[PDB]
Amino acid sequence: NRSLIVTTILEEPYVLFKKSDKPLYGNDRFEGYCIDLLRELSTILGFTYEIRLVEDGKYGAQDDVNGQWNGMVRELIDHKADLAVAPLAITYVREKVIDFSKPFMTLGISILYRKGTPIDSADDLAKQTKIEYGAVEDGATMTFFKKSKISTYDKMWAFMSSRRQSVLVKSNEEGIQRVLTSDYAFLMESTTIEFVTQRNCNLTQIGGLIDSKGYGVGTPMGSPYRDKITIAILQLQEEGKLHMMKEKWWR
Amino acid sequence: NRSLIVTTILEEPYVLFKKSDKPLYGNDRFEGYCIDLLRELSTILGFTYEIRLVEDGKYGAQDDVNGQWNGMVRELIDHKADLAVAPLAITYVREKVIDFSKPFMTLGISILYRKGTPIDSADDLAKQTKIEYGAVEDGATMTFFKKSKISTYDKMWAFMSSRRQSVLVKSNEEGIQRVLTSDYAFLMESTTIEFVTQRNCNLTQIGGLIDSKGYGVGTPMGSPYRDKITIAILQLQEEGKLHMMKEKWWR
Amino acid sequence: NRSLIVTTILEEPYVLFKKSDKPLYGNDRFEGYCIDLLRELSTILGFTYEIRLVEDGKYGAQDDVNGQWNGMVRELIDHKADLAVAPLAITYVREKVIDFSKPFMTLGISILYRKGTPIDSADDLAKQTKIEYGAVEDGATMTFFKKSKISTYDKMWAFMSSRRQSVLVKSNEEGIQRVLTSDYAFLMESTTIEFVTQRNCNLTQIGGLIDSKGYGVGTPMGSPYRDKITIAILQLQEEGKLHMMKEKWWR
Amino acid sequence: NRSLIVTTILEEPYVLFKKSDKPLYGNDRFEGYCIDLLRELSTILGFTYEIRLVEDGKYGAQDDVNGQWNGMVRELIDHKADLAVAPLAITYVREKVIDFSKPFMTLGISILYRKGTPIDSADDLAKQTKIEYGAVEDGATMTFFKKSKISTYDKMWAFMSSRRQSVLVKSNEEGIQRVLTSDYAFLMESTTIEFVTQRNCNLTQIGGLIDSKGYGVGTPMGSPYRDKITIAILQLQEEGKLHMMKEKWWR
Ligand SMILES: N[C@@H](Cn1oc(=O)[nH]c1=O)C(=O)O
Ligand SMILES: N[C@@H](Cn1oc(=O)[nH]c1=O)C(=O)O
Ligand SMILES: N[C@@H](Cn1oc(=O)[nH]c1=O)C(=O)O
Ligand SMILES: N[C@@H](Cn1oc(=O)[nH]c1=O)C(=O)O
Ligand SMILES: [Cl-]
Ligand SMILES: [Cl-]
Ligand SMILES: [Cl-]
Ligand SMILES: [Cl-]
């Protein structure tokens, strides 16, 4: 039973490089909610593993031209990883190419912006073009807008799409820092927004949740690990361990 | 400028009887998030008021038979009150008969249940008939299920409707107590669930949000106060006062 | 401009007595698709009205002996009513004695029977004499069979005719209840069959439509209201209001 | 017992290419109402099969000049297939050259058009030449008009025939698209119209059914399979399976 290769992505407080005065090795080099989850999965299900950072640095989306997937989703498809343990949104389009365990966390797309402004909803952003807004490129949020038939969101996509290179960022961190330096609103997941606004009193969520989804462990389609992982996650859920992990990393 | 009549409903931590040794009079007899909001609205917009508890003790739903509304919605329709300041959900069906200010709080329907169980979503409740579940009668949540066309929710309503007297309670507090004394899951709004679980370690929210909505001040349709109230709420929102009020009452 | 007298007949979901905990008066005593249609006609064309239930309880047919008409058709002929707003089939024989507006609904004669049987068409009923079948007396369906030169239907009429008092019922409701209690097949209009099978999972339509016709508002021949009514109906049609009414009463 | 060759044609929701990330093989490459029917026929009657799409992409009509048939009808005549399982209309002219099982579905020709217009019947289309209209070439609907002796239909055919290249399309999907991009009305079967309008709120059926017919499995004339197939279809009908299949694909 060789070690499983687990792909993930850097995103506070789910996954981050662990800091230490002394050299760190193997699994100890990383820490976070998803890293704790991965550890619990490994002992409950009995497996060793190597943590690999998704090489192209993306979550996963289908290319508009050739329809090929990228990010963690593509690494699973190509069997370059056995599992993807990260804040990976369970979506319909992704379920068509990879499998997901049951959710270990629920969330929804929302807006991150500076406080003190009259912007109070997605509509308030969509009805104007002065304040720019975006999302991380090749992520579930972007895909949500790209596929939305809801007028407000569809026009928001038209906006983002027409200014793609300027408003779609390489990482959520890049979008957050931007909201802090320029007149920019950032579309990202509520769980993360909670973490960010907790540590930046100048930031706030705008409006409520635009949708409802969950984070799940991804596996190559047909993987025998998916159902086992679901059993482990549901067990961690019932015992209140997932709640304890959330409190630990969010506070 | 006679005092305005404000209808509301008892629901912690939005509205509650203020406790005291010395007799309390007038507006001071009540307290809560919505009572603070009402106070801020009165000084900002310049009006005095009388707080009245909705006579039939209901939020508001349209009767199947005669299609007549009840609760605070009906009190506004009949002009028995000038404003309704309470955790009143802004919904399409209500907007057809009364007006709402912009929301002062965003939330969504979710599930309240005991922790330690294998129930992890609305689907887990819907696919079984042992564990009963319900909502407050004549409220936005019940109406959501009654009108839902979504498979899971549609069958959950079939369930609730067929056991109406047993599972649709007269108040949210009744539903919460039912969750603590029997194998019962309660469908109610996330903002309130947050408050309840914060004070009852044995309770927990199940799954994420089933929908997205907001609480707004209700007024008779055509009321000149609605737009004024919206300006006051948006101002309280911008200055961070609504956030301060939420923190104060949810702690 | 005195109130118009409108004759109609009881038939779910077109016309029915409205139920209420409190006393109902005037037009409010009735409800249904045709009652909604009548209301829309009254406001669009500007007239008040009295709803009268056809006294002999019949739709309308010509007596085999003296050739006199009965039902709603006869009430129009005798000018006992200004309009007939009901699920009244527009037929050639009726057009000879009264006028019809353009159709507000299209349908066709079909078979209502229990499911799980080998009966799959009119032919399957006609080729046997064990299973009895009928239609409402003095209605368009009966008249269709009585005048049909199509072998299968002509022999079906011979059958019904020879057992008239046993198989021809007083109302469609009587024929439906019978299909539910005995080995009986009922010939009636597809629109109504749709409503019935929707509420009785034990019932089903057998085969397709035996013919094609429509329901129209009837008026005494030469009535100045007929063309106006047609304008109103065509307007309700174009705006999708007739479709909305159908969905409302059929679901 | 070699596998039977089954000819069919692409037409939602009867027959369509099944979508998937993983490669699909054999029978699994297709799906739809008729594909489910075909599967049930194979297990009930005991045969394996190969699905082939009719080479010339046509349903079947007899050529004016050489009086030769084309489409699935011709493939059956020439014994290029053992069965034709598709939304194949049972018609008198086809019964002269191939055999049909009893129908598995009943329908009728009707009109597909945009809503909000004053067109309310075939007569409204026939009495004008501005709005063009047509049908799929080499199909039962076109043949119905081509052979009709009914005034309205006869002139509608004169119209279509004189503009054949412009108004007679190569597929029903082409006709539907034409309805959404130009002042065009499309003559097609009611079962399919139901499916189309259910998914395109801008479309609607115009008038009622112009005729009555059914879909049956086609076989070469004299095929020993035809009676066996009829027994299987009638059994599926009785048990309610055909109704279940219709609900599944029409939703
Ligand atoms: N978890 C997201 C990545 N991304 O992070 C957000 O907060 N929004 C977003 O699109 C994904 O799995 O695609
Ligand atoms: N806020 C609700 C009342 N009720 O409280 C809940 O939490 N659900 C629910 O239906 C309303 O305005 O109708
Ligand atoms: N609508 C019919 C009465 N009746 O109802 C049916 O369904 N068939 C029938 O003859 C009429 O106007 O005569
Ligand atoms: N099912 C038809 C083909 N076609 O599809 C329609 O809807 N009309 C029409 O002619 C046939 O078997 O010829
Ligand atoms: Cl590692
Ligand atoms: Cl008071
Ligand atoms: Cl009346
Ligand atoms: Cl195949």
UniProtKB/Swiss-Prot annotation, chains A, B, C, D:
> Which regions of this chain are Extracellular-facing, per the record's topological domains?
118-251
Carbohydrate-modified residues: 1, 202
Instruction: Name the organs or tissues of expression.
Output: Highest expression is found in the olfactory lobe, piriform cortex, dentate gyrus, hippocampus, granular cell layer of the cerebellum, and in caudate-putamen.
Entry comment on modification after translation: Sumoylation mediates kainate receptor-mediated endocytosis and regulates synaptic transmission. Sumoylation is enhanced by PIAS3 and desumoylated by SENP1.
Q: Where in the cell is it found?
A: Cell membrane; Postsynaptic cell membrane
Q: Where does L-glutamate bind?
A: 87, 89, 94, 140-141, 189
- Tell me the subunit arrangement: Homotetramer and heterotetramer with GRIK5. Tetramers may be formed by the dimerization of dimers. Assembles into a kainate-gated homomeric channel that does not bind AMPA. Can form functional heteromeric receptors with GRIK4 and GRIK5. Can form functional heteromeric receptors with GRIK3. Interacts with DLG4. Interacts with NETO2. Interacts (via C-terminus) with KLHL17 (via kelch repeats); the interaction targets GRIK2 for degradation via ubiquitin-proteasome pathway.
Its function? Answer: Ionotropic glutamate receptor that functions as a cation-permeable ligand-gated ion channel, gated by L-glutamate and the glutamatergic agonist kainic acid. L-glutamate acts as an excitatory neurotransmitter at many synapses in the central nervous system. Binding of the excitatory neurotransmitter L-glutamate induces a conformation change, leading to the opening of the cation channel, and thereby converts the chemical signal to an electrical impulse. The receptor then desensitizes rapidly and enters a transient inactive state, characterized by the presence of bound agonist.
Q: Any other noteworthy remark?
A: The postsynaptic actions of Glu are mediated by a variety of receptors that are named according to their selective agonists. This receptor binds domoate > kainate > quisqualate > glutamate. It does not bind AMPA without coexpression with GRIK5.
Family stated for the protein in its record = Belongs to the glutamate-gated ion channel (TC 1.A.10.1) family. GRIK2 subfamily.
The protein, known as:
Glutamate receptor ionotropic, kainate 2
- Provide the species name: Rattus norvegicus (Rat)
